[PDB]
Amino acid sequence: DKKYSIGLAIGTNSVGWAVITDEYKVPSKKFKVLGNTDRHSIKKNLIGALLFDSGETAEATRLKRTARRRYTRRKNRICYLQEIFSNEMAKVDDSFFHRLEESFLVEEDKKHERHPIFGNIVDEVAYHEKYPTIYHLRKKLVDSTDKADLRLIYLALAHMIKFRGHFLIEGDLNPDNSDVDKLFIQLVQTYNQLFEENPINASGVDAKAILSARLSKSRRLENLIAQLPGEKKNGLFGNLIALSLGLTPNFKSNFDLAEDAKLQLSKDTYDDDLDNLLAQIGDQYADLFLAAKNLSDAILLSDILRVNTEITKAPLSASMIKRYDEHHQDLTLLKALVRQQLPEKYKEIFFDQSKNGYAGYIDGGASQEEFYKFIKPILEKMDGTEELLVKLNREDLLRKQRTFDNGSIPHQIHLGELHAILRRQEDFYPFLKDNREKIEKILTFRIPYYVGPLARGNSRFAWMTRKSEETITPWNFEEVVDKGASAQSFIERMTNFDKNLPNEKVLPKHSLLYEYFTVYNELTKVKYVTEGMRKPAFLSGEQKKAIVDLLFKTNRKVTVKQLKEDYFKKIETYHDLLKIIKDKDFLDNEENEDILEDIVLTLTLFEDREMIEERLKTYAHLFDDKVMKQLKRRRYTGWGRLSRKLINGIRDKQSGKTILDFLKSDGFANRNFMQLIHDDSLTFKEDIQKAQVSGQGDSLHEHIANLAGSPAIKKGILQTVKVVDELVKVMGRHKPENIVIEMAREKNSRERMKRIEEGIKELGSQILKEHPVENTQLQNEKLYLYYLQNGRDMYVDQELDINRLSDYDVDAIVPQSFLKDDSIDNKVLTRSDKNRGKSDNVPSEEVVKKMKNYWRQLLNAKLITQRKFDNLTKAERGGLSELDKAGFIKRQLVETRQITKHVAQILDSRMNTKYDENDKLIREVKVITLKSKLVSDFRKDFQFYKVREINNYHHAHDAYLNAVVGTALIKKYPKLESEFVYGKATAKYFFYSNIMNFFKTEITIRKRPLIETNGETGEIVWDKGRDFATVRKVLSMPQVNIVKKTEVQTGGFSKESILPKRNSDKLIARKKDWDPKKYGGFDSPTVAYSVLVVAKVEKGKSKKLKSVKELLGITIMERSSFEKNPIDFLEAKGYKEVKKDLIIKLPKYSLFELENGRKRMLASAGELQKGNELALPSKYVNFLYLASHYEKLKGSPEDNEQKQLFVEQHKHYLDEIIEQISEFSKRVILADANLDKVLSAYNKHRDKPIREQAENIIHLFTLTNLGAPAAFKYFDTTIDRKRYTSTKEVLDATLIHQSITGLYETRIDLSQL
DNA sequence: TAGTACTCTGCCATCAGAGCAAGCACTACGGCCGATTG
DNA sequence: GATGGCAGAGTACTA
RNA sequence: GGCCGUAGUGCUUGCUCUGAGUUUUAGAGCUAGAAAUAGCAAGUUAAAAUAAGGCUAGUCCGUUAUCAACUUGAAAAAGUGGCACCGAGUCGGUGCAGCGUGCUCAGUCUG
DNA sequence: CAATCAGACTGAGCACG
């Protein structure tokens, strides 16, 4: 038995641990080794770390799941259409659908003719000649009036149904509205006709260009307003224009309606909102609103159709046909031009599929951007290509019909085309006449987002409820699915429970009881003071009732003057429902509170008007039709944090009064919620405690999963809990005195590009147009800041130069000393940092006044954030006060993160379990949490420098230093237990500035005593004479238990790319009947785990059985098949007489010990990884840190000078570091060619400065590392990977099974078996 | 000599968007919210 | 972003 | 620490959808050529699959989390490994074990 | 409103296995 402590450092992919005794010495004990080897014991130190791969989020899995569901539903739609057509298609050509299904088949596999539509070569060729694309067929069917072949009708309908289009725009679209100017003129005419007193003139205004601009919608509206006299924004005409172009205007000010009456044109509720507005004002604005709707349709369509729709009913098909024709003409013209001018490049342009060009554009995979990049210079270096170059510049040269930009086509266009086809062809096909509604339903149906998957009790994600047990098709979806219950369950499965009553659901935020509760809490804490009062007094129950009835039940906002006048002078959600139902006695009654709760619950739950009105039909008799309509109109959003049972259901045992009852009857006490619930005498606390006891706690893994945070952090937490338990078991089941823990704080380029594009569009500038920047270039911090600041200085009014970058200075708004935040939200790029003023405070008031307008504009442009703006304009608010500075200094050392709170609580609950007589938990184990700042400062101050590139020992060293610092600190300052152990401005500032000054011998010059004592107690907390030597000795130990957590690979079967056909055995069939050698397939499977099999194989013509020992990679696809029957799985692979007992399962990162301590880790069944750590001396580590200037220089000039001299005298340490690396590589790495290249590079770059040489030597440790080999770079010379691609040598080595700390092992010698 | 059989080296990885709902964590403020004895 | 798969060129040993 | 009021940012989980992309087949290539080969013509589209697949047969499920070895259990789970000292190139060596009960004394804590 | 002699453990000596 010995008092000991555990120090832990938690990372996303590493967890270090350390056990220390009283004198800060790490123990060392012998451990028994199990297995068949002759080694039965081994000595190890209680210091180490566990490394694992980072956890992942379920986002990719969710995306894959949704895609799978989408594909299934699409096939179901096509099957519905085929089922509709089946009888007549069997009459016409019975094998048509069979031919369609087997199109993906070689000729010998088809049981029908190869041609899929007509089945004979003449007919197929004629059809393809007449309709080169499906859009030709679609336009012909839409426009022509004669009979069409049934197969052709089905083909057009199937294309339309299979590829519908986006559902962003709701309602109906009329493609005939295409002209922008004509509809703008019509709208102006209607406006002038109605508003005769103040007519509006818009002649001479480029309405088409203004409205169809590529800028933002708000910018377009502003431009149109500026170029339009007689009105501005928020006027009637301005609101009409905004409504047409898509913004949501408030028509309240136009007619003084006093209600918002906002209308959105794309929303489904637009018709109801317009009906309400028309009933409010009058019926004479219907023409104007209809004109606005037509203008909106034209505005949104003209950007897509780009064709005249007055002659055809298929505008999209006409656009695709003209795209085809322009493609054809441009191709002919380009062929002629190339033939005439550059005959030698014709082959490489129109025949070579590898290089980009037309051949690679059509036959190859090259996209439109790549084709344009290839073909622009050739067109430029030719004559007669001006119009082709113009089309290229506007991105309209040689365009395919199916492209990426086709995603902006609403499904309403396809629906209109399909309806036109059905209307044309229903006279000749009665079945087409009959099934028109259901075919259109097939095209336009989509499952509501709140209904979810239509399961039948075998899905964990589903929540839908069926009122009838039968197959759900799009035609009886309403009559089978209980939509209201499905939506309510959709909302309720995600809402929280009350924390005080864990089995109780929370109330809606706008619930009436919630409103009364909040108002009563606010009212009971206001102490009135008036004449004739000796001391301030609290309001009584009757006074509060009178005040609530007279003020709260009358006016929305209650103020102190109103309280004094209407009650103290005159005498001495509720309002929203009052103006809707227009009933005061009903709302003030007490027997309809359940009805009111139901009403607010419905309005909160359902966002669809039909659902709200069908749910409220039960209360339709209580009110009138207009009241019901108003109730449907009103909708609330938000959920409270308190349950109804907690607020009003539970009652005190002594008095039989609920919390609301007590709050109403507070009287002179005026005790609030927190008080009511924390009172010892009151039974509310006891009842709350009783409820929380029920359920208790789930498993540790379940609790960690239920925590909120990153999955990688949760994985690290679980590993830390397990290693703590393992160490407790190791140390004899004696729990430690203290557990000191710490936790690290932690396409992006595409996000930056979209953000800058949106900001530039909003601001109306053209900085991107001046010089475009790619995402990779935008990844640079200086460039990103320059582009975010619109190319202008942020502290003074001047212009910055992009070509002059890498020369300015990046200045943080809050100085780095107070807060260490390096994010863009705190960084600012300016020409000179001195413009900000003082360097130890917020930017100066003069600069704030100068740049307030610019910063406001940037915020409105979303270039900077609200927090950034608030930080920048803090000088006006008052700047950085002394209390703020003290808080910033204090928060740099005291951990306050909820994740670390949780972690500490879990460890505390696991460790301390006993209770006293008075049910007071005994703090046997004290959990101390520190930030990384304390340990980092300790390392910098006392020359315990950390270099991350040497090896993985720094995790264990950090854990040990955490233990030492935390234990020493809580011994020296026992009063600091409040802020560290889980369980004035000037004075606070200088207290935390020197909190760690008892470690050091000298301060600022203060001669601190050699032996540090607690004071008031006889405890020695530190001894600079010998404890520093102990820490140095511990950090220089060569043995540290580093464990790579073995895992079984899970995930995708292989690479998702589908390769073309080739005669290789590595291809994987995409379907059971699709031979890879004839259809192509996947490759590169992921190996779940290797299996060691000792068996015999048939070799040679005689098929003699040769005993073989080898590793077999059980891939993810065949893992279940293997585990179901290993014998059959292995026999089918070709091995005979395998041994079930001798089969060994070998997951990833399995460790093997071969010779001279050389260790290899199993990367896969045919690859290995390095498994050895270089224990470089701390003298070499310190020299490398000092010479390399880690984190530049952060020392005094006097101290900086002596370290430079130290490096100068220790020049020769470089050769020894190289010597250590070389001998380690010779003993373990065995990469001879790479070692020779590294040594040659070192010899050739010997004359360069020590700084540069050390900086490059840091890279050489990538050669001698643990894990997968990686390529590094020494100066110019680059050294590639030396991969170990053979697992044959490990079959005679020693397989080590390491526990979670590595102290418990089971060595299995595979050579014997 | 032909045929396996193992080794070294370079290439290569599905990608973009649209809503909706619930929750947490943090920032920035701006107010209320620790017990015992006479 | 990297790290394992794969094709291809290359060299070596045995029937 | 929580609960209100406002505002903002980021992240997580779940659902309904969109456009592409790859793979095979269909869209008769021609002429001079014994043959390779050469010269022309053409190119834009569609069908099907989009993790193999599963049984629970649903317009459902299939890439998250969890997982050293051994023993006992169907499983969930529970068990399995002596200590001190001197040292340090991935851990080595040395030493001990493999004391219990009654009386007096003296020091510390509680009634 | 104002104050914040009995039981257990360790070491020392003697007796028995």
Domain boundaries, chain A: 60-167+411-477, 180-302, 315-405, 488-693, 748-877, 1170-1292
Q: Which of residues 917-976 of A touch strand D (CB under 7 A)?
A: none
Run of H or E residues at A1104: strand A1104-1115
Q: Any idea which nucleotide's C1' is nearest the CA of A56?
A: D64
Experimental technique, in short, is cryo-EM
Q: Any idea which nucleotide's C1' is nearest the CA of A1176?
A: D89
Q: CA–C1' distance A31–B7 (Å)?
A: 41
Q: CA–C1' distance A353–D33 (Å)?
A: 26
Run of H or E residues at A30: strand A28-35
The reply to whether A1077 has its C-beta less than 7 Å from any atom of strand D is no
Q: Which of residues 739-798 of A touch strand C (CB under 7 A)?
A: 747
Q: CA–C1' distance A911–D29 (Å)?
A: 82
Under DSSP, the state recorded for A48 is: E
User: Which residue is nearest nucleotide D23, judged by alpha carbon to C1' distance?
Assistant: A1058
The reply to whether A53 has its C-beta less than 7 Å from any atom of strand C is no
Under DSSP, the state recorded for A1000 is: S
Q: Any idea which nucleotide's C1' is nearest the CA of A1101?
A: C15
Q: How many Cβ atoms from other residues are within 10 Å of residue A904's Cβ?
A: 20
Q: Which of residues 362-391 of A touch strand D (CB under 7 A)?
A: 362-363, 365
Pairing type for strands A1087-1099 and A1104-1115 reads: antiparallel
Q: Any idea which nucleotide's C1' is nearest the CA of A1269?
A: C3
Q: Which residues of A174-192 are buried (b: 16+ CB within 10 A; e: fewer)?
A: ebebbbbeebbebbbebbe
User: Which residue is nearest nucleotide D82, judged by alpha carbon to C1' distance?
Assistant: A30
CA A150 to chain centre: 49
| CB A245, CB A299: distance < 8 Å | yes
Q: Which of residues 874-893 of A touch strand B (CB under 7 A)?
A: 874, 877
Q: Any idea which nucleotide's C1' is nearest the CA of A1285?
A: B7
The reply to whether A896 has its C-beta less than 7 Å from any atom of strand B is yes
Structure-token match 């224990």, residue found: A1175
Q: Which of residues 1071-1110 of A touch strand C (CB under 7 A)?
A: 1083-1087
User: Which residue is nearest nucleotide D20, judged by alpha carbon to C1' distance?
Assistant: A404
Structure-token match 């001894």, residue found: A1023
**How far apart are the C-alpha atoms of A576 and A636, rounded to whole Å?**
11
Is A1113 in a helix, a strand, or coil? Answer: strand
Helix ranges (H only) for A698-844 are: 700-706, 711-730, 748-763, 767-770, 775-778, 781-788
List, in order, residues 6 or more apart from A182 with CB less than 8 Å away.
none
Taking Cα atoms as reference points, which of A199, A96, A111 lies closest to residue A151? A96
| CB A602, CB A487: distance < 8 Å | no
The 3-state secondary structure of A876-935 reads HHCCCCHHHHHHHHHHCCCCCCHHHHHHHHHHHHHHCCCECCCCCECCCCEEEECCHHHH
Q: Any idea which nucleotide's C1' is nearest the CA of A1280?
A: B9
**How far apart are the C-alpha atoms of A49 and A17, rounded to whole Å?**
6
**How far apart are the C-alpha atoms of A265 and A293, rounded to whole Å?**
7
The reply to whether A478 has its C-beta less than 7 Å from any atom of strand D is no
The reply to whether A700 has its C-beta less than 7 Å from any atom of strand D is no
| CB A649, CB A523: distance < 8 Å | no
Taking Cα atoms as reference points, which of A311, A217, A232 lies closest to residue A265? A217
The reply to whether A430 has its C-beta less than 7 Å from any atom of strand D is no
Q: CA–C1' distance A1097–B1 (Å)?
A: 27
Helix ranges (H only) for A606-747 are: 609-615, 625-633, 644, 659-664, 673-678, 684-693, 700-706, 711-730
Return contacts of A239-246, CB within 8 angstroms, 24+ apart: A240/A187, A240/A191, A240/A288, A240/A292, A243/A292, A243/A296, A244/A187, A244/A292, A244/A293, A244/A295, A244/A296, A244/A299, A245/A211, A245/A217, A245/A220, A245/A221, A245/A296, A245/A299, A246/A217, A246/A296, A246/A300
Nucleotides of strand D lying closer than 7 angstroms to a protein CB: 1-5, 7-9, 11-28, 41-53, 56-70, 77, 81-93
How many angstroms is the resolution?
3.2
**How far apart are the C-alpha atoms of A349 and A391, rounded to whole Å?**
19
Instruction: Give the amino acid at A328.
Output: H
Run of H or E residues at A14: strand A14-20
The reply to whether A520 has its C-beta less than 7 Å from any atom of strand D is no
**How far apart are the C-alpha atoms of A1011 and A1019, rounded to whole Å?**
10
Q: CA–C1' distance A428–D46 (Å)?
A: 26
List, in order, residues 6 or more apart from A1188 with CB less than 8 Å away.
A1251, A1254, A1255, A1258
CA atoms within 13 A on the CB side of A1168: 22
Taking Cα atoms as reference points, which of A202, A214, A276, A275 lies closest to residue A241? A202
The four Cα atoms A465, A467, A471, A472 give a dihedral, to 10 degrees, of -70
**How far apart are the C-alpha atoms of A1122 and A1142, rounded to whole Å?**
16
DSSP string, A244-310: HHT----THHHHT-SS-----SSSTTHHHHHHHHHHHS-STTHHHHHHHHHHHHHHHHHTT--S--S
Q: Any idea which nucleotide's C1' is nearest the CA of A1305?
A: D69
